[PDB]
């Protein structure tokens, strides 16, 4: 087992709707980590997720979605309030979310409990 | 005035509209690069509208948010790291103050730039 495993970016709207299809296949949710790399907050929790993505090897794939780099459309696709925004999608929609702007190791516990209620 | 309020661009086209107007005026424009999903970047907004007033007739603010408007105008600020207040002049981007500082020294800087290509 790895000690961290890279968030995979995702690069428009095709790019999620091929991902949401791959989960289904393997009747798995995926976590969707919607940061913005000019914003700091969004930048420094990034290795505290690849760590608790590292514990959920082979049954929860992790993904970012940088909104400061990809299409408006793709953006849209978060329905994005405030930021950062964790999301845990299954069978092709969205099913819950956590909002960052607490300190990193909280955020991380809240994206955990969400993990737990839907793996 | 005590505030003059900064003009949101809305797109591209908006930019190249704004970018004329100024060219026929002989005048430089402030463009305050914002993200409304970062806090770090809408808490400077009333002490540069009270900026705005300083420079009222002489040079126009804009404030255009990264996480609103199309992906081609935020092309066009070739944003690093946010908040940015740019100059633009002649229809291009003459000079920038990286907003990642305490407001009083960023208003300072934002002063210095203007001084600078007014």
């Known amino acids: 087992r790895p000690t961290s495993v890279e968030m995979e970016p995702i690069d428009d709207s095709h ?14 949710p995926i976590i ?3 940061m913005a790399s000019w914003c700091r907050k969004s930048i420094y ?3 505290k997720l690849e760590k608790l993505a590292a514990e959920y090897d082979t049954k ?3 993904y970012s979605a940088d909104v400061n780099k ?11 309030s405030k930021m950062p925004t964790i ?3 299954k ?3 969205m099913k819950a979310e956590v909002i ?16 737990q209620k839907f793996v």
């Not at 790019?15 to 798995?28: C, G, N, P, V």
């Not at 702007?101 to 955020?107: E, P, R, T």
Request: charged share 30%; aromatic share 8%; glycine share 8%.
């Open 15 to 28: 790019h999620l709707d091929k991902i949401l299809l791959q989960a289904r296949e393997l009747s798995q």
């Open 32 to 34: 969707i980590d919607w």
């Open 45 to 47: 929790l990034k290795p």
């Open 60 to 62: 929860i794939k992790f």
């Open 70 to 80: 990809v299409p408006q459309a793709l953006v849209k696709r978060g329905n994005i």
């Open 87 to 89: 999301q845990l999608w």
């Open 91 to 93: 069978d092709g929609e």
């Open 100 to 115: 960052g702007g607490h300190k990193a190791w909280l955020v991380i516990e809240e994206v955990r409990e969400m993990i």
